[PDB]
DNA sequence: CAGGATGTATATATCTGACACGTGCCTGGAGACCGCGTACGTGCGTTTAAGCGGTGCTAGAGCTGTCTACGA
DNA sequence: TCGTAGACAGCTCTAGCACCGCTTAAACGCACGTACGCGCGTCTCCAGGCACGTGTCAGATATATACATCCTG
DNA sequence: CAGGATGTATATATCTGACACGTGCCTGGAGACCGCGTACGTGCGTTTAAGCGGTGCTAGAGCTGTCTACGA
DNA sequence: TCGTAGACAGCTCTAGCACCGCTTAAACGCACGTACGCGCGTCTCCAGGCACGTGTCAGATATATACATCCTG
């Protein structure tokens, strides 16, 4: 038992930031042009200035426990469990045969045979056109096919290109893989030992003529959280380290006082802190503390960072003789609520407060923010409280390209009668 | 102690980009210097002669690549021919 | 599917047919003024593999030799098939009487089968593929190739 | 400013511009000549390395042996030529046995 | 045709030039593939050598210097 | 009938085995003799680096590996499985070491 | 003895290194003559290369550079 | 008309000493220039490199012969090695 | 066991053109600093096209003078 | 900074390309059969060197010997 | 037709040393200008010496400063 | 003429050579037999690069499994 005294991250230890207790009724937002919002074949059902709740996916008829955000891929896994699929089935992103592509349907149980052998899905992973499911037994499922830097189709190096049919992935690292890390075509698992593995491209270690898609490691030491955005990676060693190695075009790793990453460096934590969670996008990165105060860095051109003009940091990028360019320094601001967890996209930051209160600080021109008809960008966060989910206590936040996957359940007296405060 | 200007460091550095962990041997980490040796050499003479059999007393890129193409094998050539192109365009686009 | 994926699937079906030696949807029949002829018992689509021109493989005169002894005895029919398999005359002499059907296929310039070289890891294999949709009952035919003046003088059916 | 910084290839392309001059390849040698060469050299150094990197992982754990390195160069049909007049030390043969050598019954 | 160009009474000719006692059946066009091969290997580097000086008319010395580099330096013209 | 392996299987493994190792297969001390021997006919009273020494083995060790390799075809291509004297020579001519 | 030095379980060893299925009787010391030959060809030019710089201790790189000139450039040391 | 400095004359002259009548061909009288070409060449580089792998920035006779010996075949070498020796001693003994 | 049909070694008349030597010229070099069996050979008839030259058209190699951006 | 090689428009003219009927050498086709595959640094002075022109002897040429050599009744 | 004797693929504890990264330093790089038959394989016993290191002796490679004859 | 590479005496110290008993791997010898051969450019500023020192994880190591594989009654 040499491998026993070695594992430093557990499945249970990552249960907080994925699955929940009560079967929550889901929701949607933004322009789902690729039938991604999950509102049928209707052209009228595509547009959405503000929030909603699912007709084909009720809270008690589907039992939606675990979700999965993404650009043209929005899937889910119940406690049963199930394999709900709402995405652009072009690169095999649905994971089935199906328009019915915009009709949320559970993928059959015969597809994955660990559900026919005592096991359940820990989390649902969704890249730009990728899919994979870290099963509890140890083996990892798969689906879809990643879009390359040049721009072409590949699944498992050269033995598979488009993986529409969902299949298990073979042995990669003996220690069972704990969590996942989506974003871009850049899937980045984490072993039981703490061996930051990596499949797809991860372009922003380096190579040519394929043969890299299918692997595998390496880098890092013993990372507990692997937290991937689109073209920005995030890692943290069990020895309380903070790293981020990716395409730092607009300081998306926060390891540069000046405005790509060679070998992981990132964070300078003063005094003490514990990062509860983190997530990012193409030019918009964020990690939150255990106390409550946030710590995000990104660009300041698309309004990805929520710090509207007046609240502009000293260590921030500019143009030659123009407007503010970027914010590569962390900070959670002062005028900001008790954020519990987080979710991110291209530049549409769907946050989540301690009272379940939504606050969309990003580019809401395609109504990803979800604050009615307004073409401008959300320069700071936006307290959302409409007819459907004003009272309803929010659970699992989400974001993709032009979307923001809402959800939860209707609240009781314990909400209004306790949080009547104003 | 005369300074042995070995590709050791440089040979090591380019390893990291391709592969981070690890990883070499002493015998091989010499073998690398003799892959850098034979190329730097073989390349320079299909560069040198090129200049003589095209009458120009200065080895430009004009030659270096022409050899490079003429010296590297089929698919590899176009690759490094591309990577030169790149390092050619970046060298020109500097401050 | 791509052009490469269809060619690989077409090659894997042709390799399995050459390995098994299956000659299904084909039966021998006595054609009027041609000795033995091959006729279809089932409908063969355009591009479908019919049957391999099976026999004894060998070099250039390594088939044109039993020629100089098979001219010494006229009864044994001309069943040699020469071909250029990668710069070198590689053939398949089917003079010996066997149960294979490719050697009994008759001649026609506008028939319903074309002869092609099918390589399988270095070893050449003459295969007969349907040029058009072959009807059930109709005779399988292919262009023999020998349009020379000496051969056409002895048997005039080679012209048509 | 380092020229290798500028052009963006690792293996010092000032040592290429300076090896060239006093290497006596010719009388003159343009700035890019070292550069394009440097990048010729490194697109080799790299294309080479990783073949081992993938192979050395495969057989061994992390670090490349010599007989790993050449265990690569034999197998890449392109390099197989490049390093077809050479003799990489400690290599030994990428194994093969003739068809008329293995068992038969 | 081109490869048909290297015709039997010439392969043979070329082969009797090394005391070939008898050419076998297949052996003949094998020479065409080879003579192709050899042609191929050569003309390419040579044209490539014409390229690196921008000649649309390919030189003899280009053929030669390339015929050298390959490894069988021919003498006479050059 | 004690335990035995039919003639060929053993040395076939010898291939498996010897084709696996990067282990210079002819004794060092022995070659240093042969090394120093051919020295004399070159230049009487000489020294050589132990380093250098190895290479000399290395190459001719290697040289031999492939020239025995190439030699395998020489009898493979002669209706033979077992490599005799001529076989070794034939290869020398196709290399042009002699002819 | 020197040529006796290259001993049977080493010729063989070296020969199994190219899949030699069986060494014949005569074949063995033929390797000694060859390994002599090869040794001979080499050490000579090499020593000759030590000579042209006046070293009484022969360099490794001398072996190498000579091991190059001959035609089988070895890599590693050099 | 750029001047083609061909060994023609010189190639002819040395014929006379060895053989007076005659005697050459056009094809061959080129073949001679390509025996003078490959030697002048091959010789210069085992001369050139010699200087590099014995660190001296000037090609003396020191090298030229060392190559000459190292480059010419067995009995021939000692011969031309002798003929150099000669042309070496005569060059020094001039006015 | 041997003399006669093939075609190669040999001899000598005879025209042709490339080897060879003279000349004005100009630049580079010198000076001071065993057996079944079929594949391929041999030889003669039919037939394809290589080799021949006669020659007009002009692509493009080769050389020159000028302006100027390259690299020591 | 600055000497100058390289870019380059401009221009002489060698030499490569297409033409095209014709004597015929040669590629092609084929029948017979037997040997053989196959299985069992710089300024200056100047003459050495090269492009050019021109006469003829080495050698290609061809009719014509004699000769060595291979093979069946 | 198949189970048991060889020895190869595989797993994991554990010490060792070479890979790898930090540092003062100094010079090179930067900047402005089918069948008879015997030969060779397989396996175990006898025996030669390779490999091991421990180490003292010093040849001779390597580096430096000086004088001066070589060659651009 | 004259800048300077090369000759060369002088000197530090790496590294090659001889030593030499000993555990033992390996070369050697030999008997049995079956697969197999064989016949039928320059002055100046300075940081990139290398020699040096030092800590430890990749890998050599070894006892110890389990495993694929070859072969006769």
UniProtKB/Swiss-Prot annotation, chains B, H:
Alphabetical keyword list: Acetylation, Chromosome, DNA-binding, Glycoprotein, Isopeptide bond, Nucleosome core, Nucleus, Phosphoprotein, Ubl conjugation
Glycosylation sites: 82
Principal place of residence: nucleus
Protein name: Histone H2B 1.1
GO cellular component, one term: nucleosome
Subunit structure: The nucleosome is a histone octamer containing two molecules each of H2A, H2B, H3 and H4 assembled in one H3-H4 heterotetramer and two H2A-H2B heterodimers. The octamer wraps approximately 147 bp of DNA.
Cross-link Glycyl lysine isopeptide (Lys-Gly) (interchain with G-Cter in ubiquitin) residue location(s): 90
Free-text function comment from the UniProt entry: Core component of nucleosome. Nucleosomes wrap and compact DNA into chromatin, limiting DNA accessibility to the cellular machineries which require DNA as a template. Histones thereby play a central role in transcription regulation, DNA repair, DNA replication and chromosomal stability. DNA accessibility is regulated via a complex set of post-translational modifications of histones, also called histone code, and nucleosome remodeling.
Modifications the protein undergoes after translation, according to the UniProt entry: Monoubiquitination of Lys-90 by BRE1 gives a specific tag for epigenetic transcriptional activation and is also prerequisite for histone H3 'Lys-4' and 'Lys-79' methylation.
Residues of the signal peptide: none
Keyword Glycoprotein: yes
Localization: Nucleus; Chromosome
GO molecular function, one term: structural constituent of chromatin
Sequence similarity: Belongs to the histone H2B family.
Curated annotation (Swiss-Prot), chain C:
Superkingdom classification of source: Eukaryota
Record's subcellular location: Nucleus; Chromosome
Positions of disulphide bridges: none
Protein residues bound to S-adenosyl-L-methionine: 34-36, 79, 106-107
Induction of expression: By HCFC1 C-terminal chain, independently of HCFC1 N-terminal chain. Transiently induced by TGF-beta and during the cell cycle.
Domain SET: 24-145
Effect of residue 107 to A: Strongly decreases methyltransferase activity
Outcome, altering residue 142 to F: Alters methyltransferase activity, so that both monomethylation and dimethylation take place
PTM note: Ubiquitinated and degraded by the DCX(DTL) complex.
Function: Protein-lysine N-methyltransferase that monomethylates both histones and non-histone proteins. Specifically monomethylates 'Lys-20' of histone H4 (H4K20me1). H4K20me1 is enriched during mitosis and represents a specific tag for epigenetic transcriptional repression. Mainly functions in euchromatin regions, thereby playing a central role in the silencing of euchromatic genes. Required for cell proliferation, probably by contributing to the maintenance of proper higher-order structure of DNA during mitosis. Involved in chromosome condensation and proper cytokinesis.
Sequence similarity: Belongs to the class V-like SAM-binding methyltransferase superfamily. Histone-lysine methyltransferase family. PR/SET subfamily.
Domain notes: Although the SET domain contains the active site of enzymatic activity, both sequences upstream and downstream of the SET domain are required for methyltransferase activity.
UniProtKB/Swiss-Prot annotation, chains E, G:
Residues the record lists as N6-succinyllysine modifications: 8, 54, 68
Phosphotyrosine: residues bearing it: 28, 65
GO CC, alphabetical: nucleosome; nucleus
Main location as per UniProt: nucleus
Residues modified to N6-(2-hydroxyisobutyryl)lysine: 8, 21, 36, 54, 56, 68
Keyword terms: Acetylation, Chromosome, Citrullination, DNA-binding, Hydroxylation, Isopeptide bond, Methylation, Nucleosome core, Nucleus, Phosphoprotein, Ubl conjugation
Residues with PTM N6-acetyllysine: 8, 36, 56, 68
Modified residues (N6-lactoyllysine): 8, 54, 68
Residues with N6-glutaryllysine modification: 8, 36, 54, 56, 68
Residues where N6-propionyllysine is found: 8, 21, 54, 56, 68
Modified residues (N6-butyryllysine): 8, 21, 54, 56, 68
Cross-link (Glycyl lysine isopeptide (Lys-Gly) (interchain with G-Cter in ubiquitin)) at residue(s): 68
Annotated compartments: Nucleus; Chromosome
Sites bearing Phosphoserine, chain numbering: 24
Entry's Gene Ontology molecular function annotations: DNA binding; protein heterodimerization activity; structural constituent of chromatin
GO terms for biological process, alphabetical: nucleosome assembly
Signal peptide: none
Cross-link (Glycyl lysine isopeptide (Lys-Gly) (interchain with G-Cter in UFM1)): 8
Record's keyword annotation contains Ubl conjugation: yes
UniProt PTM: Demethylation is performed by JMJD6.
Assembly and binders: The nucleosome is a histone octamer containing two molecules each of H2A, H2B, H3 and H4 assembled in one H3-H4 heterotetramer and two H2A-H2B heterodimers. The octamer wraps approximately 147 bp of DNA.
Family as reported in the entry's similarity comment: Belongs to the histone H4 family.
Record function comment: Core component of nucleosome. Nucleosomes wrap and compact DNA into chromatin, limiting DNA accessibility to the cellular machineries which require DNA as a template. Histones thereby play a central role in transcription regulation, DNA repair, DNA replication and chromosomal stability. DNA accessibility is regulated via a complex set of post-translational modifications of histones, also called histone code, and nucleosome remodeling.
Name of protein: Histone H4
Annotated organism of origin: Xenopus laevis (African clawed frog)
Taxonomic placement: Eukaryota, Metazoa, Chordata, Craniata, Vertebrata
Parent-record interval covered: 25 to 102 of 103
From Swiss-Prot, chain F:
Modified residues (Phosphothreonine): 44, 71
Residues recorded as bearing N6-methyllysine in the entry: 1, 20, 28, 43, 86
UniProt GO molecular function: DNA binding; protein heterodimerization activity; structural constituent of chromatin
Lipidation (S-palmitoyl cysteine): 74
Residue list for modification N6-(2-hydroxyisobutyryl)lysine: 20, 28, 43, 86
Keyword tRNA processing: no
Residues with N6-glutaryllysine modification: 20, 43, 79, 86
Keywords: Acetylation, ADP-ribosylation, Chromosome, Citrullination, DNA-binding, Hydroxylation, Lipoprotein, Methylation, Nucleosome core, Nucleus, Palmitate, Phosphoprotein, Ubl conjugation
Residues that bear N6,N6,N6-trimethyllysine: 20, 43
Modified residues (Phosphotyrosine): 5
Modification type N6-crotonyllysine: residues: 20
GO cellular component labels: nucleoplasm; nucleosome
Record PTM: Acetylation is generally linked to gene activation. Acetylation at Lys-86 (H3K122ac) by EP300/p300 plays a central role in chromatin structure: localizes at the surface of the histone octamer and stimulates transcription, possibly by promoting nucleosome instability. H3R2me2a is present at the 3' of genes regardless of their transcription state and is enriched on inactive promoters, while it is absent on active promoters.
Phosphoserine PTM sites in chain numbering: 21, 50
Modified residues annotated as N6-succinyllysine in this record: 20, 43, 86
Similarity comment text for this entry: Belongs to the histone H3 family.
Complex and partners: The nucleosome is a histone octamer containing two molecules each of H2A, H2B, H3 and H4 assembled in one H3-H4 heterotetramer and two H2A-H2B heterodimers. The octamer wraps approximately 147 bp of DNA.
Protein name (record): Histone H3.2
Provenance organism: Xenopus laevis
Complete-protein stretch covered: 38 to 136 of 136
């Amino acid at each position: 038992k040499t491998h026993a005294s070695h594992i430093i991250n557990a499945q249970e230890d990552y249960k907080h930031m994925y699955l929940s207790v009560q079967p929550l009724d889901i929701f949607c937002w933004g322009t789902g042009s690729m039938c991604e919002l999950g509102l049928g074949p209707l052209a009228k059902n595509k547009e959405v200035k503000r929030p909603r709740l699912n007709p084909f996916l009720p809270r008690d008829e589907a039992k939606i426990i675990s979700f999965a955000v993404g650009g043209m891929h929005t899937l889910a896994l119940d406690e049963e469990s199930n394999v709900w699929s709402w995405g652009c089935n072009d690169v095999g992103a649905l994971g089935r045969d199906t328009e019915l592509e915009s009709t949320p349907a559970k993928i059959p149980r015969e597809s994955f045979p660990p559900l026919a052998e005592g096991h359940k899905v820990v989390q649902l992973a969704a890249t730009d056109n990728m899919s994979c499911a870290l099963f509890s037994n140890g083996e990892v499922y798969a689906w879809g096919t990643f879009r390359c830097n040049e721009g072409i189709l590949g699944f498992y190096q050269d033995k598979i290109k488009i993986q529409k049919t969902p299949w298990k992935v073979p042995t990669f690292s003996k220690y069972n893989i704990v969590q996942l890390a989506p974003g871009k075509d850049h899937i980045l698992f984490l072993d039981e030992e703490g061996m930051v593995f990596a499949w797809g491209n991860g372009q922003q270690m380096e190579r040519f003529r394929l043969k890299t898609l299918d692997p595998r490691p390496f880098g890092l030491r013993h990372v507990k959280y692997i937290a991937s955005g689109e073209n920005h990676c995030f890692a943290l060693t069990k020895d309380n380290k903070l790293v981020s190695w990716g395409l730092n075009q607009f300081g998306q790793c926060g390891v540069s006082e000046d405005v790509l990453v060679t070998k992981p460096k990132r964070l300078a934590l003063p005094d003490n802190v514990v990062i509860r969670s983190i997530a990012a996008g193409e030019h918009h990165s964020l990690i939150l503390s255990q106390d409550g105060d946030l710590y995000s860095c990104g660009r300041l051109d698309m309004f990805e960072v929520g710090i509207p003009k007046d609240n502009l940091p000293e260590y921030t990028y500019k143009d030659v003789h123009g407007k503010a360019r970027a914010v590569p320094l962390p900070t959670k601001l002062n005028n900001v609520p008790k954020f519990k967890s987080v979710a991110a996209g291209s530049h549409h930051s769907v946050a989540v407060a301690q009272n379940g209160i939504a606050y969309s600080w990003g580019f809401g021109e395609t109504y990803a923010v979800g604050l009615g008809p307004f073409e401008d960008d959300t320069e700071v966060p936006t307290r959302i409280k409409n007819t459907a989910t004003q009272d309803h206590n929010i659970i699992l936040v989400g974001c993709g390209g032009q979307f923001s996957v809402s959800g939860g359940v209707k609240l009781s007296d314990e909400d209004a009668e306790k949080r009547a405060d104003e | 102690k005369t300074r042995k200007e070995s590709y050791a460091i440089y040979v090591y550095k380019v390893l990291k980009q391709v592969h981070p962990d690890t990883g070499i041997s002493s015998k091989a980490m010499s073998i690398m210097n003799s892959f850098v040796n034979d190329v730097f050499e073989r390349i320079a003479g299909e560069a040198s002669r090129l200049a003589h059999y095209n009458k120009r007393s200065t080895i430009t890129s004009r030659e270096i690549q022409t050899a490079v193409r003429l010296l590297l094998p089929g698919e590899l050539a176009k690759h490094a021919v591309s990577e030169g192109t790149k390092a050619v365009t970046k060298y020109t686009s500097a401050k | 599917k791509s052009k490469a994926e269809l060619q690989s699937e077409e090659r894997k079906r042709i390799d399995e047919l050459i390995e098994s030696g299956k000659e299904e949807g084909m039966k021998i029949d006595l054609i009027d003024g041609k000795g033995r002829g091959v006729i279809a018992t089932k409908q063969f689509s355009r591009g479908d593999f019919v049957v391999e021109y099976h026999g004894d493989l060998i070099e250039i005169t390594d088939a044109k030799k039993r020629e100089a002894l098979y001219a010494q005895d006229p009864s044994t029919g001309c069943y040699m098939y020469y071909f250029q398999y990668l710069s070198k005359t590689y053939c398949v002499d089917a003079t010996r009487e066997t149960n294979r059907l490719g050697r009994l296929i008759n001649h026609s310039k506008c028939g319903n089968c074309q002869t092609k070289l099918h390589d399988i890891d270095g070893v050449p294999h003459l295969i007969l593929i349907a040029s058009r949709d072959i009807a059930a009952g109709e005779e399988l035919l292919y262009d023999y190739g020998d349009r020379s003046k000496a051969s056409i003088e002895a048997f005039p059916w080679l012209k048509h | 400013k380092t020229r290798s910084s500028r052009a963006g290839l690792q293996f010092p392309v000032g040592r290429v511009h300076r090896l060239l001059r006093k290497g006596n390849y010719a009388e003159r040698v343009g700035a890019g000549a070292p550069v394009y060469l440097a990048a010729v050299l490194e697109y080799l150094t790299a294309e080479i390395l990783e073949l081992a990197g993938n192979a050395a992982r495969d057989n061994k754990k992390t670090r490349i042996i010599p007989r790993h390195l050449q265990l690569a160069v034999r197998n890449d049909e392109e390099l197989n030529k490049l390093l077809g007049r050479v003799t990489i030390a400690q290599g030994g043969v990428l194994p093969n046995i003739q068809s008329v050598l293995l068992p038969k019954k | 045709d081109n490869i048909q160009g290297i015709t039997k009474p010439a392969i043979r000719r070329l082969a009797r030039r090394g005391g070939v006692k008898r050419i076998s059946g297949l052996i003949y066009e094998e020479t065409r593939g080879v003579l192709k091969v050899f042609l191929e290997n050569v003309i390419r580097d040579a044209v490539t050598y014409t390229e690196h000086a921008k000649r649309k008319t390919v030189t003899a010395m280009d053929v030669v210097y390339a015929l050298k580099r390959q490894g069988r330096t021919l003498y006479g013209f050059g | 009938k004690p335990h035995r392996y039919r003639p060929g299987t053993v040395a076939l493994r010898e291939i498996r085995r010897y084709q696996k190792s990067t282990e210079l297969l002819i004794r060092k001390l022995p070659f240093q003799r042969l090394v120093r021997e051919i020295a004399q006919d070159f230049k009487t009273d000489l020294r050589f680096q132990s380093s250098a020494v190895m290479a000399l083995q290395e190459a001719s060790e290697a040289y031999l590996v492939a020239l025995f390799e190439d030699t395998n075809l020489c009898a493979i291509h002669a209706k033979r499985v077992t490599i005799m004297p001529k076989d070794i020579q034939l290869a020398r001519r196709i290399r042009g070491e002699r002819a």
